[PDB]
Amino acid sequence: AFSIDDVAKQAQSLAGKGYETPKSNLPSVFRDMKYADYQQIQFNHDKAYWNNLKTPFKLEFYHQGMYFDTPVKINEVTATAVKRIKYSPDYFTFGDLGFAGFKVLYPINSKDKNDEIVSMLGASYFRVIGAGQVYGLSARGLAIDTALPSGEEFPRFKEFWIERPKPTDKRLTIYALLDSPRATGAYKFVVMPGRDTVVDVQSKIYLRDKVGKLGVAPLTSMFLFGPNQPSPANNYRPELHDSNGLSIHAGNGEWIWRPLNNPKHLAVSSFSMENPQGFGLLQRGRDFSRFEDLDDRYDLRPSAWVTPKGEWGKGSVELVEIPTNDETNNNIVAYWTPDQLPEPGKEMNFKYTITFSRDEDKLHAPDNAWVQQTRRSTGDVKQSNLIRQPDGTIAFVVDFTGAEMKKLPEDTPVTAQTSIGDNGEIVESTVRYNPVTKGWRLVMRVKVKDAKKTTEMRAALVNATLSETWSYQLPANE
Amino acid sequence: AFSIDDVAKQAQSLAGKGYETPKSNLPSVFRDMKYADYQQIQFNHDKAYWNNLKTPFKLEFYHQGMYFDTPVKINEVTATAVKRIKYSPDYFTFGDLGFAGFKVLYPINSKDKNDEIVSMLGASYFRVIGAGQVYGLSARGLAIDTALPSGEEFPRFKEFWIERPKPTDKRLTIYALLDSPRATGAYKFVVMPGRDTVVDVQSKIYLRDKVGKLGVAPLTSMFLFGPNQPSPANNYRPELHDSNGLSIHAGNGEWIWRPLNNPKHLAVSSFSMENPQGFGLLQRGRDFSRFEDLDDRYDLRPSAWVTPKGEWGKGSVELVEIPTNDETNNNIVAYWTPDQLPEPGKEMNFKYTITFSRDEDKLHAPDNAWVQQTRRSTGDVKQSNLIRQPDGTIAFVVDFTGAEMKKLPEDTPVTAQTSIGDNGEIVESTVRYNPVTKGWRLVMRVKVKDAKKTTEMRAALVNATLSETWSYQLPANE
Ligand SMILES: OC[C@H]1O[C@@H](O[C@H]2[C@H](O[C@H]3[C@H](O[C@H]4[C@H](O[C@H]5[C@H](O[C@H]6[C@H](O[C@H]7[C@H](O[C@H]8[C@H](O[C@H]9[C@H](O[C@H]%10[C@H](O[C@H]%11[C@H](O[C@H]%12[C@H](O[C@H]%13[C@H](O[C@H]%14[C@H](O[C@H]%15[C@H](O[C@@H]%16[C@@H](O)[C@H](O)[C@@H](CO)O[C@H]%16O)O[C@H](CO)[C@@H](O)[C@@H]%15O)O[C@H](CO)[C@@H](O)[C@@H]%14O)O[C@H](CO)[C@@H](O)[C@@H]%13O)O[C@H](CO)[C@@H](O)[C@@H]%12O)O[C@H](CO)[C@@H](O)[C@@H]%11O)O[C@H](CO)[C@@H](O)[C@@H]%10O)O[C@H](CO)[C@@H](O)[C@@H]9O)O[C@H](CO)[C@@H](O)[C@@H]8O)O[C@H](CO)[C@@H](O)[C@@H]7O)O[C@H](CO)[C@@H](O)[C@@H]6O)O[C@H](CO)[C@@H](O)[C@@H]5O)O[C@H](CO)[C@@H](O)[C@@H]4O)O[C@H](CO)[C@@H](O)[C@@H]3O)O[C@H](CO)[C@@H](O)[C@@H]2O)[C@H](O)[C@@H](O)[C@@H]1O
Ligand SMILES: OC[C@H]1O[C@@H](O[C@H]2[C@H](O[C@H]3[C@H](O[C@H]4[C@H](O[C@H]5[C@H](O[C@H]6[C@H](O[C@H]7[C@H](O[C@H]8[C@H](O[C@H]9[C@H](O[C@H]%10[C@H](O[C@H]%11[C@H](O[C@H]%12[C@H](O[C@H]%13[C@H](O[C@H]%14[C@H](O[C@H]%15[C@H](O[C@@H]%16[C@@H](O)[C@H](O)[C@@H](CO)O[C@H]%16O)O[C@H](CO)[C@@H](O)[C@@H]%15O)O[C@H](CO)[C@@H](O)[C@@H]%14O)O[C@H](CO)[C@@H](O)[C@@H]%13O)O[C@H](CO)[C@@H](O)[C@@H]%12O)O[C@H](CO)[C@@H](O)[C@@H]%11O)O[C@H](CO)[C@@H](O)[C@@H]%10O)O[C@H](CO)[C@@H](O)[C@@H]9O)O[C@H](CO)[C@@H](O)[C@@H]8O)O[C@H](CO)[C@@H](O)[C@@H]7O)O[C@H](CO)[C@@H](O)[C@@H]6O)O[C@H](CO)[C@@H](O)[C@@H]5O)O[C@H](CO)[C@@H](O)[C@@H]4O)O[C@H](CO)[C@@H](O)[C@@H]3O)O[C@H](CO)[C@@H](O)[C@@H]2O)[C@H](O)[C@@H](O)[C@@H]1O
């Protein structure tokens, strides 16, 4: 009955007309709120949608506040009707504005507890979690001109339709209409809560005008510090980040792992390929000892893996790393950016799944080893007297692990194929067996010729390829 | 037949005569050796003592080299004889000097592998390990004038007698004669290899002249950096130390835990008491993730716990912390120093056990919680906008755990009784439940008034005492 086509015709139609700028009529008392103040507004769980039905799903809504200062329209779809969900203040306690966004609840952790699984709130952003997870990185519907000096353009999901589920349904269907100065689109999301929460996405996109850069299936995260770039000041937390790497499964079948930085200057990195097999911002390594944060539980925050359905043609998986002095800034972005876009008006179809998981092993081929961690260190040489003498190099300790690598005999003759750009020199490239992890450790020591330039390096473990490619960048002014 | 009395009469007799300075006739080629060079000398395992007997014990010997440049005499005791073990170069390959010291082998880890359990080498030092352990901290027979500006005096074990074991014996008996400018002594060690290796010690000590300070049952270790005092430079190792705290079981029954520092200036700390119940340099926290060192395995290095037999009267358990830029210096010392020593010639009896273990829980009363770790951090206040704003305080995150604490209901109302010296002010003293550890976490934030003075603080968890006392010192110029 109702389908993506219904929403695509609105999108098609919006693309053919001048963009209408949303206008805020939000009172100052709400717009001026900071996060802590925004908490004063809570939803009345007695008024949650589907409270009268035998579904484990429920729908709750956000009030406008902070920079969430334009309304979105929300519709329920039934077998027989599309019904606007009417706004009311009586959905909230505060101790015709319109909803800011919505969330979905489901007993994903405990049978008699309705826990959040999806949050759609801000622009075209959503956050998703599976069982035992805590909200971390975000996804968007679309990105336009991300990292361009001209200024990024942020689409919004301005309207939603949410199908009322049947009592036995284990998935939830959501449609969204996207509008942005130079683009519109129609989105069908099928959400499947589980150990992982999986989101099936179909999109239909239309430019209203030409753009510098489109970013398809965007992910947005945060990296403040980690063992590859330790906290400049003492912190009880060894690490702080919603993600620690970009994993790519290339067109050509190579696995690439780019550990994240919090750089001094904006860094955009393009992995140019044809027909990407997948990409994800991953949180690899979940021992609580790596984080020690009892409030935000970064150890419990998901990885997100994007899997295209079909051939996305020629473009790049692009990473954006933004300087931040704190964790409140989303300083990591990843997307697919097509090399060539169509003329305005012409429809682009993108189909993909997003998997939100804490099983990074499952987000990787079992016959291909992967980097558990990248530890930076002062490069040294142990003297005859056992004193470790610094020699001016930087050292990277890169531990590989894997479902198949953890199985290999200790005596397996593993070596490293490495490379470095011109601003750097590899002094040492050693591989040894790690009997604690059943994996293999690479130690790479490098001299930087000019600290004021970027240095890029690559490494993989081979017998005679066993591992993904560690693709590391050492930011200028590090 | 043979007993400690045999050795005590030699000791008694040496104390009544002028001290004879040992003389080195070691060739330059050996004295000039650094550790790596000293390795060139290996013992011929075919010539190990007791190779002709049905004992799991074996005895091997060290060649002189480095600063091990005076001989020690070694004797075997049998039922019928004391026999000098004759020196020979044919005990070694090099690819009448006399032995430098000896080691004991035993199948403590694997049934057909003779692994080291005891090393007696250098002055009056020995190192001991149980099953699955790697050599770490040391013990001595005695310490004299440790940390005194006049200069420490180092006794040596100049002669040893080692009882030949019966085939079924699970212990080994060793006697040693101690000589030092101003003191002599006789030592019986009974070594019991196990999961822990336990050393039963009887000593008889005689001063040849008055001394500034005697140190009974000394332990010697090393602390380079840890989470309470993180590596000033990037290191892949989160921590590096053979020990991370002094545990005291006081005369009065209090448990005290003093986390170690690598200070900028010599720090001596005295815990004055009567009838100490025990003390030990402990390595608390053995996840490999804390160390990451595959060469030296600090995670596998023992704790040593000293248990007096009898009442040692009035004195102090004393800790000495020495500045070091590297791990090769033994910059941690602990001992019992009597308040009052007898006149020279008069015999002092000290009986005690040393337990070398990796079960720190077993080195502590089950009804008393203990500090798993002390993490230093920049003190901050989270703002309304979730940004953590530094306020100029230093924060200590102190996690408690325990066989009984891990059992307590989460809702148990645990609070902290704390205190600080005059150079400091406690701004925050918070206790929360740690659901990952089943323990409780203390966060203490303090302002230092003068960074150029030492600051001391104490804290314990109480219901209405649950924990040992965390006795922390913040070194001047930290
Ligand atoms: O019944 C029974 C019982 O119960 C109980 O209880 C219980 C429970 O239960 C319950 C349940 O619960 C649940 C839970 O809950 C919880 C909660 O939760 C929640 C959550 O919260 C959280 C939070 O979150 C938050 C967030 O955060 C985040 C973030 O991120 C984010 C973001 O934000 C941001 C932003 O963004 C934006 C964007 O941006 C972009 C950009 O752009 C920009 C630009 O930029 C540029 C640059 O520039 C720069 C700037 O910016 C700056 O400013 C400067 C200065 O500095 O700098 C510079 O540089 O530049 C560059 C170069 O040049 C460029 O390129 C760029 O562009 O800028 C501009 C300016 O100029 C601007 O404007 C713009 O914007 O860009 C970039 C690039 O591209 C990118 O990347 C970015 O992105 O933008 C856009 C457009 O516009 C927008 O839209 C956005 O917004 O930004 C800012 C700045 O800008 C910042 O600030 C921020 O931050 O956002 C987004 C969107 O929205 C998102 O997505 C994201 O996420 O951050 C971080 C990262 O970084 C992360 O990490 C975080 O997380 O945030 C937001 C806002 O604010 C909010 O909204 C939220 O909220 O978080 C925290 C922390 O972490 C945590 O803690 C929390 O938690 O949330 C959610 C939502 O999301 C909700 O839903 C939830 O609810 O919480 C609470 C506390 O509070 C608690 O309490 C609770 O619990 O949960 C769980 C899970 O987890 C579950 O499971 C559960 O279930 O619930 C239910 C329902 O309700 C009920 O029923 C129940 O009850 O449970 C539990 C468990 O189990 C238990 O325990 C309990 O017990 C009770 O009590 C009783 O009674 C009962 O009985
Ligand atoms: O058969 C089958 C198969 O097998 C195979 O193989 C296998 C195997 O098997 C086998 C077995 O094996 C085994 C193993 O083995 C191994 C080995 O092992 C070994 C070991 O080694 C190790 C090492 O060790 C070493 C050591 O080290 C250590 C150290 O410590 C020590 C010490 O040292 C030090 C010194 O000390 C001294 C003292 O000092 C004191 C002081 O005083 C001083 C003064 O001071 C002052 C100050 O001042 C300062 C100065 O000093 C400076 O200089 C400056 C400048 O800077 O500064 C300043 O400041 O001041 C202050 C304030 O003012 C004051 O207070 C002070 O006083 O000064 C002066 C000057 O002026 C001076 O003079 C003086 O001295 O004081 C303080 C205070 O009180 C104190 O504390 C201190 O103490 O002093 C004294 C008197 O004089 C002396 O005596 C001493 O010496 O010092 C120096 C400086 O001074 C330094 O440098 C040094 O370092 O020492 C002591 C004594 O001796 C001891 O006790 C200790 O320990 O260090 C650290 C700490 O720190 C530690 O940690 C370490 O450890 O060292 C030594 C010397 O050098 C040597 O001797 C040794 O050796 O270590 C390393 C590292 O860690 C390691 O790595 C190694 O390992 O050793 C042992 C012995 O001990 C032996 O025995 C053994 O053997 O190793 C190798 C490698 O190499 C390997 O390879 C092997 O493996 O083991 C295990 C266990 O672990 C076992 O289990 C096993 O069994 O064996 C058998 C038999 O042989 C056979 O049979 C078999 O075969 O097994 C394995 C496992 O299972 C496997 O894997 C394999 O495979 C094969 O191959 C095949 O073929 C076959 O088939």
Numbering used by the authors:
A (entry chain A), B (entry chain A): 22 to 116, 127 to 495, 498 to 511
Sentences from the paper on this structure:
Most Gram-negative bacteria synthesize osmo-regulated periplasmic glucans (OPG) in the periplasm or extracellular space. In this study, structural and functional analyses of OpgG and OpgD from Escherichia coli revealed that these proteins are β-1,2-glucanases with remarkably different activity from each other, establishing a new glycoside hydrolase family, GH186. Furthermore, a reaction mechanism with an unprecedentedly long proton transfer pathway among glycoside hydrolase families is proposed for OpgD. The conformation of the region that forms the reaction pathway differs noticeably between OpgG and OpgD, which explains the observed low activity of OpgG.
To generate hypotheses regarding the very low reaction velocities of EcOpgG, we determined the complex structure of EcOpgG (D361N mutant) with β-1,2-glucan at 1.81 Å resolution. In the catalytic pocket of the complex, the electron density of a Sop16 molecule was observed. The dynamic conformational change from a loop (residues 409–425) to two β-strands upon substrate binding is a unique feature found in EcOpgG. However, the β-sheet interacts not with the substrate but with the α-helix 3 in the complex. The motion of α-helix 3 is induced by the interactions between Y56 in the helix and the 6-hydroxy group of the Glc moiety. These observations suggest that the closure motion of α-helix 3 is required for forming the β-sheet. A β-1,2-glucan molecule binds to the substrate pocket in the complex of EcOpgG at almost the same position as EcOpgD, except at the subsites –5 to –7 in EcOpgD. The only Glc moiety forming 1S3 in EcOpgG is the well-superimposed Glc moiety at subsite –1 in EcOpgD. However, electron density for nucleophilic water is poor in EcOpgG, which strongly supports the observed low SGL activity of EcOpgG. However, the absence of a nucleophilic water molecule and the presence of a branched proton transfer pathway from Wat2 may be responsible for the low specific activity of EcOpgG (0.11 U/mg).
